[PDB]
Design a binder for this molecule. Structure first.
Ligand SMILES: *Cc1cc2c(cc1C)nc1c(=O)[nH]c(=O)nc-1n2C[C@H](O)[C@H](O)[C@H](O)COP(=O)(O)OP(=O)(O)OC[C@H]1O[C@@H](n2cnc3c(N)ncnc32)[C@H](O)[C@@H]1O
Ligand SMILES: OC[C@H]1O[C@@](CO)(O[C@H]2O[C@H](CO)[C@@H](O)[C@H](O)[C@H]2O)[C@@H](O)[C@@H]1O
Length: 538
């Protein structure tokens, strides 16, 4: 069924949709590539009269079904490929803090490269460069960074998600006076912007202005000689704990392969001059042996998933650790140095395709080690319980990152508001919770028992990280709300637990219900949604 009366000057065509993990694949989805923000608004106003949803089509990296659902032949949805034309950017350095305005289809690699050429950069960002700015803002995309002990924040920088850098944005919003959708610009100190800073797919952003700080030189050191029992030891310290590196450098990520002893630890340190033996790099993606999988790894993945040989999982984790550790040694990449974007961007899409769950655990900075040690202790014991039964649900690594919260005091204006729906929006009732520990576990899509295992982990995370100790919000882009059959399917999590995570500690005027109401007012025809967003009641 071809859509009727579609704007004549905007070419409409069928194009398949396939997310990065490969588990959402829809054929022949009606797609167009708007040349301008005005063309986006034309498509929205046609869609409301014709019963089609409207979603931005970025790089299709998201795991959760926020664009459209899997298994739906040729949906009543029109996708707007923002990557072709909505990519322009400009920089205004006429104030005490530089500002970059960019159309929402630009990639993070292009954005950060444009900033570098102007002497500017950001504290943290997602590891891939092949993501649109609009996709990253929609789900509070983030990297890893908190301040090292003694570090002062640079004006125009933040330790939160990319959503926290927004100073202004232009969204497609219903204008009640004219009865039509139109472009509307919002300032970061306008409370009405709050649901749009990270709208989870409930809006369409055509352009945003972000703060940018003077660019930093970073060193990025990798270590594979620290046993997980030491790295993730109980608070009570001693040794090379993950928290000791947060204090010395502030920017830390651990990737811990299954059934292996030593995680791949990456530590980024702000380092003005290149250390004597560090290798300078002037490009991003410096771990080619991680981006280009060796045959040993791809062969084991295929045996495990396609041939059902799950007992090869421990060997598979060892192969993955070998690829990372011996690969870093072969490419002389364990101690790198250069402008920030070259070290912040480090994952290409040719890496191992995996699904992942994800959670942000808000807590006091001093509690990070406890959080990590608690999660690692529970995970190891569950993995063992499953291995006892001959099951290997998790065949990818555990990944740990830590960031600040989306605290508007870090935005370079007075009265900035927190994103209403960011997973790391602050908790007014707990001013002492000032970090978020991000926890994820990766596994090949479709691995037997994965959902059942992810459900056990999710139930324990919600039970454990509670009270005045910590709180939990799901990482929107990843898996959550698990039943034994699927992710994003548990009724209690969708109807009660997640919405409550956005009411706890918040004023009624700025909580889950207020955000939902504002997004509905901005989109009365409900153009901007997918079955998951409907099931969440957002
Ligand atoms: C695949 C992947 C993703 C990823 C990652 C590593 C890989 C291999 N590492 C990440 C990380 O280090 N930190 C982080 O926070 N996220 C990481 N991700 C996830 C990624 O950031 C998100 O999935 C992001 O949304 C992907 O961007 P992309 O451009 O690919 O977006 P999409 O999948 O097509 O769309 C996702 C949702 O965003 C909406 N969207 C996209 N553009 C807009 C605009 N302009 N306006 C409003 N909404 C927009 C889509 O409609 C959809 O709802
Ligand atoms: O971050 C410094 C780095 O940026 C460059 C451009 O790539 O210079 C930019 O920033 C300088 C310092 O503010 C400015 O002098 C210059 O005008 C601006 O382009 C590099 O030359 C510099 O090493």
């Amino acid at each position: 069924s071809q859509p009727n009366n579609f704007p004549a000057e905007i070419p409409l065509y069928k194009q398949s949709f396939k997310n990065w993990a490969g588990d959402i694949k829809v054929d022949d989805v009606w797609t167009c590539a708007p040349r301008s923000a005005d063309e986006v608004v034309k498509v929205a106003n046609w869609a409301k009269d014709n019963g089609y949803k409207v979603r931005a089509r970025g790089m299709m990296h998201n795991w959760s079904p926020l664009t459209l659902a899997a298994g739906v032949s040729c949906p009543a949805v029109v996708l707007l490929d923002t990557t072709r034309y909505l990519t322009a950017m400009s920089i205004d350095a006429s104030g005490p803090v530089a500002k970059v305005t960019a159309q929402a289809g630009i990639t993070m690699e292009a954005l950060l490269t444009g900033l570098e050429k102007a002497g500017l950069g950001v504290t943290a960002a997602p590891a891939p460069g092949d993501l649109t700015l609009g996709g990253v803002l929609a789900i509070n995309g983030h990297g890893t960074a908190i301040p090292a002990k003694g570090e002062r924040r640079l004006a125009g920088a933040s330790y939160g998600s990319i959503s926290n850098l927004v100073l202004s944005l232009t969204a497609v919003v219903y204008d009640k006076a004219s009865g039509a959708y139109a472009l509307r610009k919002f300032a970061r100190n306008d409370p009405q912007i709050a649901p749009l800073l990270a709208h989870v797919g409930r809006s369409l952003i055509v352009e945003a202005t972000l703060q940018a700080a003077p660019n930093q030189r970073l060193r990025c050191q990798s270590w594979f000689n620290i046993p997980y029992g030491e790295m993730f030891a109980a608070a009570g310290s001693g040794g090379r704990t993950f928290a000791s590196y947060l204090d010395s450098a502030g920017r830390v990520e651990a990737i811990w392969f299954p059934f292996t002893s030593n995680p791949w630890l990456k530590v980024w340190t702000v380092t003005p001059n290149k250390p004597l033996f560090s290798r300078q790099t002037d490009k991003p993606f410096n771990y080619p042996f991680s981006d280009n999988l060796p045959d040993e790894v791809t062969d084991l993945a295929n045996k495990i998933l396609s041939l059902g040989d799950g007992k090869l999982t421990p060997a598979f984790g060892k192969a993955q650790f070998a690829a990372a550790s011996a690969g870093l040694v072969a490419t002389a990449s364990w101690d790198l140095w250069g402008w920030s974007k070259n070290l912040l961007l480090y994952v290409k899409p040719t890496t191992l395709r995996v699904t992942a769950n994800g959670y942000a655990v808000l807590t006091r900075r001093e509690n990070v080690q406890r959080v990590l040690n608690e999660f690692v202790t529970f995970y190891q014991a569950r993995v063992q319980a499953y291995q006892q039964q001959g099951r290997y649900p998790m065949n990818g690594p555990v990944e740990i990152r830590v960031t600040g919260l989306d605290d508007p005091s870090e935005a370079a204006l007075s009265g900035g508001v927190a994103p209403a729906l960011s997973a790391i929006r602050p908790r007014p009732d707990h001013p002492e919770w000032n970090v978020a520990v991000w926890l994820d576990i990766l596994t090949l899509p479709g691995t037997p028992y994965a959902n059942q295992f992810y459900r056990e982990i999710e139930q324990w995370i919600e039970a454990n990280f509670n009270g005045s100790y910590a709180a939990v919000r799901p990482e929107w882009s990843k898996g959550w709300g698990y039943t034994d059959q699927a992710a994003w399917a548990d009724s209690a999590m969708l109807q009660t637990t997640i919405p409550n995570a956005f009411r706890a500690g918040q004023p009624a005027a700025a909580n889950w219900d207020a955000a939902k109401a504002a997004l509905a007012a901005y989109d009365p025809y409900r153009l901007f949604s997918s079955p998951l967003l409907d099931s969440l009641g957002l």
